[PDB]
C-alpha cells in the first residue's frame, strides 16, 4: 500500500507491454496525481472488462482510474472511467498513438486514515519512489522513461528522464550526471580466489559450476570518492530491481575495508538462470557468488 509499489506495478505493466516510451507524471508527490504514459502494445477491445480481475482492480479499489489505450490493430483508441470495483463507468472511443496510458487520481481517498499517513509521512515514501525509479532508469536500456512532478499552483518541473541509450552507463550519467560518473569504475567478474574460498567454505568442485553472471559500476576506494550513505546502490537480479542482503552487506563491508568512512556509489546486476531462484529472494550456491564478489571487490580496489 505505498505509492513505490503502485508506481513499480504500472511500470512493469508498461515494460511488458513492450514499449520504448515510458513517462511518469505526478501531482502533488503523487498524493493528487499518478499518470504512467507508454507507447507499448496497447490494450485489444476483447480483454477491456478482463483488464481489472493486479495492479488494475486494487487501484480502482484504491484511488479514480482512467485508462486511455490503443492496439496495434484497433482503428480509434479508447478511454475509460473506472469505479471503486472496476466496473467500467465510461467507455469512449479516444483517438491516441499506440501504447497506454493510466490516470491514478487521489489515492488513497477511500481509506482517510491511509490517505493521512500518505500526506503526513510524503517525503520518505516519495524518496523510496525516487529510488525505484532511479532502478529502473538504469536498468532499462534502450527505453526512454523520464519522471515529471507539479506542485499545488506551482509550474510544472521535470524530475528525470533517459533517452533511450543502450548502455547501463551513460543510464547513469543521464540520471545523476557524468560527474557521478568520474567516481565509478566498472565492475570487473573474477574467479574465486582459494583463500576466500577457504573463508566460504569451497572447494574447486563447488566452484566449478559457476553461472553467475555479474556486472555494473562501484565507487573507487580512494579516500573522499565514495559517498557519506548508501543513497545510491542498485541492485538486480535478472534485470529486476531488488535488494540481497547478504551482497549489500558484503559490497558494502569490502569497501569499507578499503574506505573505511564512505559508501559506495552501487549499480550491480546479477544474471543467473530463473530457477536457481526462489520466494526474500534465494539464490542457489549464494556463497558462490558472494565468493565471486568479494574476490573481485578486492582485485579491483586493490592497487
Do not use: W
Not at 523520464?146 to 547513469?172: A, D, F, H, M, Y
Not at 542498485?234 to 529486476?240: L, V
Request: proline share 4%; glycine share 6%; aromatic share 8%.
Amino acid at each position: 500500500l505505498s505509492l513505490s509499489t503502485a508506481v513499480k506495478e504500472l511500470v512493469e505493466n508498461s515494460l511488458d507491454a513492450g514499449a520504448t516510451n515510458i513517462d511518469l507524471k505526478l501531482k502533488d508527490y503523487g498524493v493528487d496525481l499518478i499518470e504512467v504514459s507508454d507507447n507499448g502494445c496497447g490494450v485489444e477491445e476483447e480483454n477491456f472488462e478482463g483488464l481489472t480481475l493486479e495492479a488494475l482492480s486494487s487501484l480502482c479499489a484504491l484511488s479514480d482510474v482512467t485508462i486511455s489505450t490503443c492496439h496495434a490493430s484497433a482503428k480509434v483508441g479508447t478511454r475509460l472511467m473506472f469505479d471503486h470495483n472496476g466496473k467500467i463507468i465510461q467507455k469512449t472511443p479516444y483517438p491516441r498513438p499506440r501504447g497506454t496510458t493510466v490516470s491514478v487520481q487521489q489515492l488513497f481517498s477511500t481509506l482517510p486514515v491511509r490517505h493521512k499517513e500518505f500526506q503526513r509521512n510524503i517525503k520518505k515514501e516519495y524518496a523510496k519512489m525516487v529510488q525505484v525509479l532511479h532502478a529502473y532508469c538504469i536498468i532499462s536500456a534502450g527505453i526512454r522513461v523520464s519522471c515529471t512532478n507539479q506542485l499545488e499552483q506551482g509550474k510544472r518541473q521535470p524530475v528525470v528522464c533517459t533517452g533511450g541509450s543502450p548502455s547501463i552507463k551513460e543510464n547513469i550519467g543521464s540520471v545523476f550526471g557524468q560527474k557521478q560518473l568520474q567516481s565509478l569504475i566498472p565492475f570487473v567478474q573474477l574467479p574465486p580466489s582459494d583463500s576466500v574460498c577457504e573463508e566460504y567454505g569451497l572447494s574447486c568442485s563447488d566452484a566449478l559450476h559457476n553461472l553467475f553472471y555479474i556486472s555494473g559500476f562501484i565507487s573507487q576506494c580512494t579516500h573522499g570518492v565514495g559517498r557519506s550513505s548508501t543513497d545510491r546502490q542498485f541492485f538486480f537480479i535478472n534485470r529486476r530491481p531488488c535488494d540481497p542482503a547478504k551482497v549489500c552487506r558484503l559490497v558494502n563491508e569490502v569497501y569499507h575495508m578499503y574506505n573505511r568512512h564512505q559508501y559506495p556509489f552501487v549499480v550491480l546486476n546479477i544474471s543467473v538462470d530463473s530457477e536457481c531462484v526462489d520466494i526474500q529472494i534465494l539464490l542457489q550456491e549464494e556463497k558462490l557468488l558472494l565468493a565471486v564478489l568479494k574476490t573481485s571487490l578486492i582485485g579491483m580496489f586493490d592497487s
